[PDB]
C-alpha cells in the first residue's frame, strides 16, 4: 500500500439526463437528444453536496464533437450537449492544490431519461486547503 496509505476515500456521484429534441432532424433516422452531465460529492451520510474538492473538471468527449475536451471550473461542473449516440467517456477531475488528476470512467447513454452513477476516488491528505475542504464531506 505504501504511499497509498496517506489518502482518504470519497464517493462522487455523476448525474446524467437526456431527452429527444424533435426540432432537430434525425441522423440516419436516429433522433438527436439534448443531454447533460453534472458531478456532486456525497458526504458520510450519502447526502449530495457541492464537489468543491475539484478546482476543474474536463469532459473528454467522443471526437465526433467539436473541441471535445470541455473544461468547467464551478460546481456542479454541468455540461450540456446534443448528440445521436451514446458513448463511453473519461471525465478528468482535478483535485484542489494540484493534488492530482483522477480519470473517472463514465458511460453516456440513452437507456434512461436520467441516471446516476457513483465512483469512489482516493484523495491525498498532504495539501492543507484540500484537507480542510475534505472535512466538509466526512472523516479525514
Amino acid at each position: 500500500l505504501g504511499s497509498m496509505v496517506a489518502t482518504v476515500k470519497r464517493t462522487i456521484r455523476i448525474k446524467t439526463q437526456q431527452h429527444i429534441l424533435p426540432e432537430v432532424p434525425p441522423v440516419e433516422n436516429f433522433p438527436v437528444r439534448q443531454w447533460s452531465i453534472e458531478i456532486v460529492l456525497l458526504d458520510d451520510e450519502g447526502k449530495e453536496i457541492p464537489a468543491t474538492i475539484f478546482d476543474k473538471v474536463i469532459y473528454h468527449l467522443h471526437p465526433t464533437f467539436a473541441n471535445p475536451n470541455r473544461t468547467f471550473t464551478d460546481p456542479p461542473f454541468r455540461i450540456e450537449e446534443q448528440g445521436w449516440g451514446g458513448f463511453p467517456l473519461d471525465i478528468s477531475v482535478f483535485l484542489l492544490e494540484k493534488a492530482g488528476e483522477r480519470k473517472i470512467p463514465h458511460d453516456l447513454n440513452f437507456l434512461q431519461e436520467s441516471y446516476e452513477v457513483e465512483h469512489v476516488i482516493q484523495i491525498p491528505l498532504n495539501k492543507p486547503l484540500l484537507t480542510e475542504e475534505l472535512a466538509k464531506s466526512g472523516s479525514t
Binding site: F30, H62, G85, N109, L111
Partner: peptide, 8 residues
C-alpha cells in the same frame, strides 16, 4: 433508440 451507440 435508447440503445443508440457510437463506435470508439
Amino acid at each position: 433508440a435508447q440503445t443508440a451507440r457510437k463506435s470508439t
